[PDB]
Amino acid sequence: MKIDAIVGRNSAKDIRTEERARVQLGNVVTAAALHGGIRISDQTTNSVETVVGKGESRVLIGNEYGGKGFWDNHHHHHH
Amino acid sequence: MKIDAIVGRNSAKDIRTEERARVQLGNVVTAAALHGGIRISDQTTNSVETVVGKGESRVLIGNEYGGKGFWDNHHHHHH
Amino acid sequence: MKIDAIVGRNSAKDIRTEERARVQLGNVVTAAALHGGIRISDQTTNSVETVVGKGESRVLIGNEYGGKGFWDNHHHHHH
């Protein structure tokens, strides 16, 4: 009670990634989407229990700003 | 911000993504949708139990702002 | 109001990475998204209990700015 800071949590209980699975847990901010300023300091709270990815799965648990950070179509993957 | 507690949670119980599936669990904000939205403490509350994606599925569990973040349409065919 | 302690934690309880799996725990800042801060652009709080990746898996637990740090963009069948 009585807060002036950031509020809005995303939570996960269990995560299982198997086989060619990539998971981003937390936050991804693309440059274009948001860079400082008097931006948001309040976000929607999401909470998941168990999440499993099987077979080339891409899973992002958290907040993606922009929509080019974790997911994409086809780029120059050189590593 | 100074709003005491944000109300509006999304909750997921079980998630299974199988086979080339992509899942966004959380909140996606496109740039266009929210830059200087410095106060959002009353949103929609959605709870789901089990969600399964099978075979090249896109699934977003959470909030999508802009409608362009996770479900980025075919914008880059040149890639 | 008067803050020195930032509110916005990414927490993890247990992590298991096996077989060519790589995990980034903390924060990954690429130069492009922001260099050395510039406000708190993002400090969204995420909390996960147990996360397991098995089999050449990529798991990032925390915040990725830029999307060029721990991973880069890939070649996936269907966007």
mmCIF file of C-alpha atoms in Angstrom:
data_model
loop_
_atom_site.group_PDB
_atom_site.id
_atom_site.type_symbol
_atom_site.label_atom_id
_atom_site.label_comp_id
_atom_site.label_asym_id
_atom_site.label_seq_id
_atom_site.Cartn_x
_atom_site.Cartn_y
_atom_site.Cartn_z
ATOM 1 C CA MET A 1 0.000 0.000 0.000
ATOM 2 C CA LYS A 2 1.381 3.338 -1.228
ATOM 3 C CA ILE A 3 3.702 2.747 -4.146
ATOM 4 C CA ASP A 4 4.979 5.163 -6.811
ATOM 5 C CA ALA A 5 7.364 2.789 -8.492
ATOM 6 C CA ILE A 6 6.992 0.143 -11.195
ATOM 7 C CA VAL A 7 4.298 -2.402 -10.801
ATOM 8 C CA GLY A 8 3.417 -5.216 -13.170
ATOM 9 C CA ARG A 9 4.978 -8.625 -12.961
ATOM 10 C CA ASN A 10 5.130 -11.524 -15.299
ATOM 11 C CA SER A 11 5.623 -14.812 -13.592
ATOM 12 C CA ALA A 12 6.337 -18.367 -14.552
ATOM 13 C CA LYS A 13 6.348 -21.428 -12.407
ATOM 14 C CA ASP A 14 7.903 -24.174 -14.511
ATOM 15 C CA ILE A 15 9.504 -24.096 -17.943
ATOM 16 C CA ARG A 16 10.716 -27.040 -19.895
ATOM 17 C CA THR A 17 12.357 -26.466 -23.211
ATOM 18 C CA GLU A 18 13.341 -29.545 -25.168
ATOM 19 C CA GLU A 19 14.808 -30.045 -28.599
ATOM 20 C CA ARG A 20 15.910 -26.998 -30.641
ATOM 21 C CA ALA A 21 14.014 -24.897 -28.203
ATOM 22 C CA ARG A 22 14.769 -21.324 -27.486
ATOM 23 C CA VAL A 23 13.265 -19.506 -24.602
ATOM 24 C CA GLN A 24 13.367 -15.996 -23.564
ATOM 25 C CA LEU A 25 12.387 -15.469 -20.039
ATOM 26 C CA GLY A 26 12.074 -11.928 -18.865
ATOM 27 C CA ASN A 27 12.034 -8.987 -21.204
ATOM 28 C CA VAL A 28 13.105 -8.101 -24.733
ATOM 29 C CA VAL A 29 13.228 -4.506 -25.853
ATOM 30 C CA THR A 30 13.936 -3.715 -29.447
ATOM 31 C CA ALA A 31 15.661 -0.285 -29.983
ATOM 32 C CA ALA A 32 12.945 1.108 -32.190
ATOM 33 C CA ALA A 33 10.091 0.270 -29.797
ATOM 34 C CA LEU A 34 11.079 2.173 -26.700
ATOM 35 C CA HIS A 35 14.130 4.085 -25.630
ATOM 36 C CA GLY A 36 13.859 5.881 -22.308
ATOM 37 C CA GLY A 37 11.803 9.048 -22.020
ATOM 38 C CA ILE A 38 8.730 9.393 -19.872
ATOM 39 C CA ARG A 39 7.618 5.933 -20.715
ATOM 40 C CA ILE A 40 5.439 3.344 -19.049
ATOM 41 C CA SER A 41 6.231 2.269 -15.479
ATOM 42 C CA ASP A 42 3.161 0.156 -15.158
ATOM 43 C CA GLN A 43 2.486 -3.073 -16.993
ATOM 44 C CA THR A 44 0.065 -5.914 -17.152
ATOM 45 C CA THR A 45 0.648 -8.795 -14.835
ATOM 46 C CA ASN A 46 0.713 -12.270 -16.337
ATOM 47 C CA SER A 47 1.389 -15.488 -14.529
ATOM 48 C CA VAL A 48 1.850 -18.958 -15.955
ATOM 49 C CA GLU A 49 2.474 -22.207 -14.257
ATOM 50 C CA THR A 50 3.939 -24.835 -16.494
ATOM 51 C CA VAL A 51 5.145 -24.216 -20.014
ATOM 52 C CA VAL A 52 6.850 -26.798 -22.191
ATOM 53 C CA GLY A 53 8.311 -26.489 -25.667
ATOM 54 C CA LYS A 54 8.930 -29.495 -27.725
ATOM 55 C CA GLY A 55 10.613 -29.678 -31.094
ATOM 56 C CA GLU A 56 12.032 -26.441 -32.544
ATOM 57 C CA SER A 57 9.823 -24.355 -30.313
ATOM 58 C CA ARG A 58 10.252 -20.648 -29.704
ATOM 59 C CA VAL A 59 8.862 -19.475 -26.413
ATOM 60 C CA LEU A 60 9.013 -16.088 -24.872
ATOM 61 C CA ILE A 61 7.880 -15.712 -21.364
ATOM 62 C CA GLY A 62 7.840 -12.099 -20.482
ATOM 63 C CA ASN A 63 7.528 -8.839 -22.262
ATOM 64 C CA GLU A 64 8.476 -8.217 -25.856
ATOM 65 C CA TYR A 65 8.685 -4.678 -26.998
ATOM 66 C CA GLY A 66 8.885 -4.146 -30.646
ATOM 67 C CA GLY A 67 8.271 -7.653 -31.824
ATOM 68 C CA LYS A 68 11.648 -8.127 -33.478
ATOM 69 C CA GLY A 69 13.653 -9.138 -30.515
ATOM 70 C CA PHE A 70 12.984 -12.781 -29.910
ATOM 71 C CA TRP A 71 10.926 -13.662 -32.964
ATOM 72 C CA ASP A 72 11.514 -13.044 -36.620
ATOM 73 C CA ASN A 73 10.992 -14.647 -40.000
ATOM 74 C CA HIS A 74 14.394 -15.231 -41.619
ATOM 75 C CA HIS A 75 17.563 -13.246 -41.119
ATOM 76 C CA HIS A 76 21.318 -13.648 -41.297
ATOM 77 C CA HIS A 77 22.072 -16.110 -38.570
ATOM 78 C CA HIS A 78 25.817 -16.218 -38.794
ATOM 79 C CA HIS A 79 26.394 -17.894 -35.475
ATOM 80 C CA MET B 1 3.186 4.870 -11.283
ATOM 81 C CA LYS B 2 1.429 6.088 -8.071
ATOM 82 C CA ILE B 3 -1.554 3.865 -8.557
ATOM 83 C CA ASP B 4 -1.601 1.483 -5.660
ATOM 84 C CA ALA B 5 -1.664 -1.987 -7.242
ATOM 85 C CA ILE B 6 -2.479 -2.896 -10.821
ATOM 86 C CA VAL B 7 -5.561 -4.894 -11.378
ATOM 87 C CA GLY B 8 -5.781 -7.008 -14.477
ATOM 88 C CA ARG B 9 -3.939 -10.251 -14.648
ATOM 89 C CA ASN B 10 -3.579 -12.823 -17.267
ATOM 90 C CA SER B 11 -2.973 -16.290 -16.063
ATOM 91 C CA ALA B 12 -2.074 -19.515 -17.745
ATOM 92 C CA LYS B 13 -2.012 -22.870 -16.103
ATOM 93 C CA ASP B 14 -0.532 -25.243 -18.655
ATOM 94 C CA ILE B 15 1.132 -24.531 -21.970
ATOM 95 C CA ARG B 16 2.441 -26.983 -24.420
ATOM 96 C CA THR B 17 3.895 -25.931 -27.662
ATOM 97 C CA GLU B 18 4.780 -28.711 -30.037
ATOM 98 C CA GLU B 19 6.313 -28.719 -33.463
ATOM 99 C CA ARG B 20 7.572 -25.354 -34.875
ATOM 100 C CA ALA B 21 5.316 -23.584 -32.471
ATOM 101 C CA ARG B 22 5.827 -20.067 -31.273
ATOM 102 C CA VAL B 23 4.400 -18.794 -28.047
ATOM 103 C CA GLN B 24 4.374 -15.495 -26.427
ATOM 104 C CA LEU B 25 3.522 -15.574 -22.803
ATOM 105 C CA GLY B 26 3.391 -12.166 -21.286
ATOM 106 C CA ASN B 27 2.779 -8.827 -22.780
ATOM 107 C CA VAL B 28 3.785 -7.463 -26.135
ATOM 108 C CA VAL B 29 3.909 -3.806 -26.813
ATOM 109 C CA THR B 30 4.404 -2.508 -30.278
ATOM 110 C CA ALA B 31 6.055 0.974 -30.473
ATOM 111 C CA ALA B 32 3.033 2.569 -32.037
ATOM 112 C CA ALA B 33 0.742 1.316 -29.291
ATOM 113 C CA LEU B 34 2.472 2.609 -26.127
ATOM 114 C CA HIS B 35 5.427 4.921 -25.663
ATOM 115 C CA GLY B 36 4.467 7.534 -23.120
ATOM 116 C CA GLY B 37 1.653 5.615 -21.478
ATOM 117 C CA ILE B 38 2.845 6.486 -18.006
ATOM 118 C CA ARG B 39 -0.089 4.918 -16.026
ATOM 119 C CA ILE B 40 -1.945 1.703 -16.807
ATOM 120 C CA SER B 41 -3.301 0.052 -13.737
ATOM 121 C CA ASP B 42 -6.699 -1.252 -14.792
ATOM 122 C CA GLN B 43 -6.703 -3.851 -17.504
ATOM 123 C CA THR B 44 -8.524 -7.011 -18.550
ATOM 124 C CA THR B 45 -8.152 -10.125 -16.416
ATOM 125 C CA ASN B 46 -7.999 -13.415 -18.369
ATOM 126 C CA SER B 47 -7.239 -16.875 -17.047
ATOM 127 C CA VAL B 48 -6.773 -19.980 -19.130
ATOM 128 C CA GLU B 49 -5.941 -23.481 -18.059
ATOM 129 C CA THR B 50 -4.369 -25.608 -20.704
ATOM 130 C CA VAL B 51 -3.307 -24.442 -24.112
ATOM 131 C CA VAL B 52 -1.608 -26.640 -26.633
ATOM 132 C CA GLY B 53 -0.102 -25.777 -29.983
ATOM 133 C CA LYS B 54 0.556 -28.445 -32.436
ATOM 134 C CA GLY B 55 2.204 -28.041 -35.779
ATOM 135 C CA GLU B 56 3.562 -24.611 -36.655
ATOM 136 C CA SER B 57 1.175 -22.876 -34.270
ATOM 137 C CA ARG B 58 1.298 -19.261 -33.108
ATOM 138 C CA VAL B 59 -0.068 -18.694 -29.658
ATOM 139 C CA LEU B 60 -0.032 -15.542 -27.577
ATOM 140 C CA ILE B 61 -1.047 -15.832 -24.026
ATOM 141 C CA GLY B 62 -1.234 -12.411 -22.504
ATOM 142 C CA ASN B 63 -1.771 -8.949 -23.810
ATOM 143 C CA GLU B 64 -0.875 -7.759 -27.272
ATOM 144 C CA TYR B 65 -0.701 -4.055 -27.760
ATOM 145 C CA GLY B 66 -0.618 -2.797 -31.228
ATOM 146 C CA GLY B 67 -1.565 -6.097 -32.756
ATOM 147 C CA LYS B 68 1.696 -6.127 -34.499
ATOM 148 C CA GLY B 69 4.106 -7.443 -31.921
ATOM 149 C CA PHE B 70 3.727 -11.196 -31.826
ATOM 150 C CA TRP B 71 1.601 -11.509 -34.825
ATOM 151 C CA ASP B 72 3.799 -9.541 -37.074
ATOM 152 C CA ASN B 73 2.273 -10.140 -40.451
ATOM 153 C CA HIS B 74 4.257 -10.955 -43.577
ATOM 154 C CA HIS B 75 6.050 -7.625 -43.872
ATOM 155 C CA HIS B 76 9.438 -8.910 -44.840
ATOM 156 C CA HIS B 77 9.169 -11.184 -47.886
ATOM 157 C CA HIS B 78 12.562 -9.947 -49.012
ATOM 158 C CA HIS B 79 14.205 -11.868 -46.214
ATOM 159 C CA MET C 1 9.769 9.904 -5.350
ATOM 160 C CA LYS C 2 13.223 9.315 -3.887
ATOM 161 C CA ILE C 3 14.512 6.021 -5.137
ATOM 162 C CA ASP C 4 17.899 4.508 -5.338
ATOM 163 C CA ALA C 5 16.672 0.959 -5.281
ATOM 164 C CA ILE C 6 15.027 0.122 -8.552
ATOM 165 C CA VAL C 7 11.883 -1.816 -8.641
ATOM 166 C CA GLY C 8 11.832 -4.419 -11.326
ATOM 167 C CA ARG C 9 13.385 -7.760 -10.546
ATOM 168 C CA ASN C 10 13.844 -10.791 -12.675
ATOM 169 C CA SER C 11 13.973 -13.776 -10.436
ATOM 170 C CA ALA C 12 14.625 -17.440 -10.995
ATOM 171 C CA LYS C 13 14.683 -20.221 -8.464
ATOM 172 C CA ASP C 14 16.066 -23.257 -10.220
ATOM 173 C CA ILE C 15 17.679 -23.697 -13.618
ATOM 174 C CA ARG C 16 18.802 -26.894 -15.268
ATOM 175 C CA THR C 17 20.575 -26.782 -18.557
ATOM 176 C CA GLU C 18 21.814 -29.964 -20.116
ATOM 177 C CA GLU C 19 23.488 -30.999 -23.332
ATOM 178 C CA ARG C 20 24.886 -28.036 -25.332
ATOM 179 C CA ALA C 21 22.409 -25.750 -23.618
ATOM 180 C CA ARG C 22 23.317 -22.178 -22.923
ATOM 181 C CA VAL C 23 21.811 -19.942 -20.344
ATOM 182 C CA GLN C 24 22.115 -16.297 -19.814
ATOM 183 C CA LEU C 25 21.149 -15.211 -16.356
ATOM 184 C CA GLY C 26 20.782 -11.521 -15.676
ATOM 185 C CA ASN C 27 20.603 -8.776 -18.249
ATOM 186 C CA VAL C 28 21.905 -8.463 -21.762
ATOM 187 C CA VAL C 29 22.235 -5.023 -23.137
ATOM 188 C CA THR C 30 23.171 -4.536 -26.729
ATOM 189 C CA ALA C 31 24.609 -1.108 -27.694
ATOM 190 C CA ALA C 32 21.871 -0.432 -30.229
ATOM 191 C CA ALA C 33 18.883 -0.516 -27.831
ATOM 192 C CA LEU C 34 20.536 1.675 -25.230
ATOM 193 C CA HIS C 35 24.138 2.152 -24.340
ATOM 194 C CA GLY C 36 24.457 3.087 -20.717
ATOM 195 C CA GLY C 37 20.970 3.533 -19.490
ATOM 196 C CA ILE C 38 19.050 6.669 -20.435
ATOM 197 C CA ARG C 39 16.193 6.547 -17.950
ATOM 198 C CA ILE C 40 14.759 3.274 -16.916
ATOM 199 C CA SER C 41 13.313 2.349 -20.279
ATOM 200 C CA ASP C 42 12.336 -1.020 -18.947
ATOM 201 C CA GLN C 43 12.417 -2.637 -15.565
ATOM 202 C CA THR C 44 9.560 -5.054 -15.896
ATOM 203 C CA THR C 45 9.626 -7.654 -13.184
ATOM 204 C CA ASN C 46 9.530 -11.324 -14.090
ATOM 205 C CA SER C 47 9.760 -14.243 -11.720
ATOM 206 C CA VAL C 48 10.202 -17.895 -12.606
ATOM 207 C CA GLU C 49 10.680 -20.865 -10.353
ATOM 208 C CA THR C 50 12.139 -23.758 -12.266
ATOM 209 C CA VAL C 51 13.428 -23.739 -15.802
ATOM 210 C CA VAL C 52 14.994 -26.687 -17.564
ATOM 211 C CA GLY C 53 16.428 -26.829 -21.028
ATOM 212 C CA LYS C 54 17.626 -30.030 -22.495
ATOM 213 C CA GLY C 55 19.277 -30.608 -25.818
ATOM 214 C CA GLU C 56 21.154 -27.721 -27.455
ATOM 215 C CA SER C 57 18.675 -25.340 -25.909
ATOM 216 C CA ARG C 58 18.906 -21.599 -25.530
ATOM 217 C CA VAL C 59 17.520 -20.030 -22.441
ATOM 218 C CA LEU C 60 17.798 -16.448 -21.388
ATOM 219 C CA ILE C 61 16.602 -15.524 -18.001
ATOM 220 C CA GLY C 62 16.424 -11.801 -17.618
ATOM 221 C CA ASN C 63 16.168 -8.813 -19.876
ATOM 222 C CA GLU C 64 17.561 -8.667 -23.416
ATOM 223 C CA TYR C 65 17.873 -5.275 -24.958
ATOM 224 C CA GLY C 66 18.521 -5.180 -28.609
ATOM 225 C CA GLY C 67 17.928 -8.819 -29.354
ATOM 226 C CA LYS C 68 21.480 -9.197 -30.549
ATOM 227 C CA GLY C 69 23.076 -10.151 -27.292
ATOM 228 C CA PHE C 70 22.410 -13.743 -26.365
ATOM 229 C CA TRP C 71 20.815 -14.710 -29.625
ATOM 230 C CA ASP C 72 20.345 -13.276 -33.029
ATOM 231 C CA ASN C 73 17.600 -13.749 -35.533
ATOM 232 C CA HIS C 74 17.074 -17.208 -37.044
ATOM 233 C CA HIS C 75 15.678 -19.253 -39.926
ATOM 234 C CA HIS C 76 12.377 -20.702 -38.854
ATOM 235 C CA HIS C 77 9.794 -22.417 -40.996
ATOM 236 C CA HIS C 78 6.863 -20.044 -40.759
ATOM 237 C CA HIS C 79 6.850 -16.796 -38.911
#
